[model samples]
Target chain A: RPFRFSPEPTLEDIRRLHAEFAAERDWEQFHQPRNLLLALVGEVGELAELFQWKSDTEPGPQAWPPKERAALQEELSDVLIYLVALAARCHVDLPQAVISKM
Target chain B: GPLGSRPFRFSPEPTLEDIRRLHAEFAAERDWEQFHQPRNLLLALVGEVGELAELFQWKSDTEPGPQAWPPKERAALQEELSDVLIYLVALAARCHVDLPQAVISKMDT
Candidate 1:
């Protein structure tokens, strides 16, 4: 299924989507904070490796080759997905946290 | 001032703000804010998440638990998780989000 986000997704919307995603996979049983946290970190590492040795002057991932850029984007989304899941299990309102921090 | 033990620990589950505070102190001590901009931190955050994911590539979703895995794998998972959280908290701090407060307030109702 395609993932859709409102032009501007509220924290509630993101949480709802995450819930549905987990439920669909029957993965709620494994959504514990500790496990989700581990999964999140792994995704982060994969994202980082993409830019590992690029020179500072090089363009960001957005400017990479189309295929490379797309891969980077996918990894970013994966990080956010796990992040949202981790926050939900821990009862943290991630969008609110982003807003408050801003 | 000389550096000492961190004022707060991530143990017993730390709130987002707690993690943010710790990250702020950490960066301040190292004078690392020069490199902690939103874009830079965001990239770092994703990188840590990738590391976290590497641990589970071979395991089925249901078998991801530390108790279900070998000791070395479990230890590695915990370390990577901590890394992801530290970067996330730091990124939020740079962006001026009071993460824990925001989290609690949003869930209040």
Candidate 2:
């Protein structure tokens, strides 16, 4: 109720929101670099599960049912947060790194 | 999470050294050691926290233990919680804040 993605959210906005969520629970003791990476891989599998049994189709989710699209969005969002999470954990600048790479 | 073995555990064996070495190689590999300076790294982690706060904003209610989280919420929590710990130690390294020492040092008070 207090906060969420605004229409203009960016990586910086995303990062701070997640940090407080962890602090509220005092959950930092569990989120080490290796473990974050491990969890990132797990999320990869979770995303893949959505596509695992689906028949091949066009690139977008427009044809997919509402629930399926929602599920896909959740998984992809999970993937991005972890991506942000790992970059932070490893002390790398994610946006800069992305820009530098491309 | 534990394959039905033990109740959920935090980091049973995550040492600071492990995190430091892991990060050293990661940046060294990518050649971002310069980009990952203390200020930059600190800011980098600051960014992560923002993303984390998004999880609590929606339909999730007031309390947790009895809230009956669905599988997806639980899973999302699982991943987000870990990111905080992971980034803390990393910034600790940059600042030379010995987290474990700080843990014991501050606790008896």
Candidate 3:
């Protein structure tokens, strides 16, 4: 089943869900900060490959056809998932970190 | 300047907004916004990630930590990670994605 979220879930909510996701698969043993960081980099590469040859002036996802746009969105989400997972392992409060930096 | 805690508000732990603001300022100073579209920024981000991976390419999993790794290698890893983050923050800003908010709002309930 797809993961569901509240209308306005918070950072805490995502962290909890991701934690459970790993727990269910018994994957926490592999989720050390270094490993998660590496995984996050890999995901970023996957996302970037989607736009590799596109011109800087190329239309953004807003103008893409449904299939292409969906592909882009999925890749972006993958990058985010790894990022959050890495941050969790590092014990970084990302939202608060972002806000504090403001 | 003593080794311990010089008087500065600069955080040892920077927030996303902090990095985003720095990226924005740097781009503004150079007028690089035209080149900072999502595609280019994403490419830049991945390029940095590649650099980061290269630093770890020959290392074993047991050699991944700063304390366990060579000082120079650790330093390089830190730099590459910063590059990845700067580009990600720039892309988020360009795309108008409140990264922190979006991550939270998209979580499983």
Candidate 4:
């Protein structure tokens, strides 16, 4: 499930890490399938907000200034984390799903 | 830096103004104002709404009513609701919108 995640982390890595986080916080009960989906949506929307006020001539997010790109990465990371969590809750193998989805 | 201290007051059911101030204090405590511009806040509001809608996307209409779902879902729902509201209030406050007064004046005056 790593896909474009580069040489570092795979989706399973993130899923395992987030699972540990929730277990430690006693938050797994609140991380239900639909709830995780919801959280993912919110994070996506937050990422979208970054582009709402751009000038007509501005470039895509990847070309954004460093600070804004940092925000973009953070928001995108949140969506990914919640997405893997949701997939785990739903028993979906995201890596295979992404391959098939492509 | 004692980042968790409460410097703003809140009501049992706060007006938009109170929420706006509360969030302001919150971001201030965390030194987050640099990220609280109107554009960013608007996006945060959108994200919060996304979470709120996501929870209801696959559910029966009855599933949303209080006490109808599992306890954890209810608690999570409340947190999402508050997050959405706080983001909205922060967005409005950042843009100098008189949201509370406008709502009052807008109520079929």
True contacts kept of each: 0.02, 0.00, 0.09, 0.01
Docking quality level of the chain pair in candidate 2:
incorrect
Taken in order, the candidates have interface RMSDs of 10.7, 18.7, 7.4, 18.3
| Tens digits of lDDT, candidate 3, B1-109 | 4755332121233455556666678788999988888977887877877786686677665644543466666555556555665677677656555565555544433
lDDT of 1: 0.56
Tens digit of per-residue lDDT, candidate 3, span A14-77: 5666788789999989987668877787777777676666655555655667676556655565
> Any runs in candidate 2 off by more than 4 Å, and if so which?
A1-7, B1-109
Q: Report the Cα lDDT for residue B77, model 2.
A: 47
Tens digits of per-residue lDDT for model 2, A1-102: 421122223444445555656788997775655565557666656755765575434333435676775565455456556655554554444444332322
TM-score of each: 0.50, 0.45, 0.65, 0.47
Residue B48 lDDT, candidate 3, scale 0-100: 73
Instruction: Please compute DockQ, using alpha carbons, for every candidate against the native two-chain complex.
Output: 0.06, 0.02, 0.15, 0.03
| Pairwise DockQ winner, candidates 1 and 4 | 1
Ranking by DockQ: 3, 1, 4, 2
Q: In candidate 4, list every pair of residues with a backbone clash.
A: A42-B47
DockQ-superior candidate, 2 or 4: 4
TM-score of 4: 0.47
Model 1 residue A68 lDDT? Answer: 69
| Runs in model 4 lying further than 4 Å from the true structure | A1-5, A55-58, B1-109
The CAPRI quality class of candidate 1 comes to incorrect
Error of 4 at B96 (Å): 34
Candidate number with greatest DockQ = 3
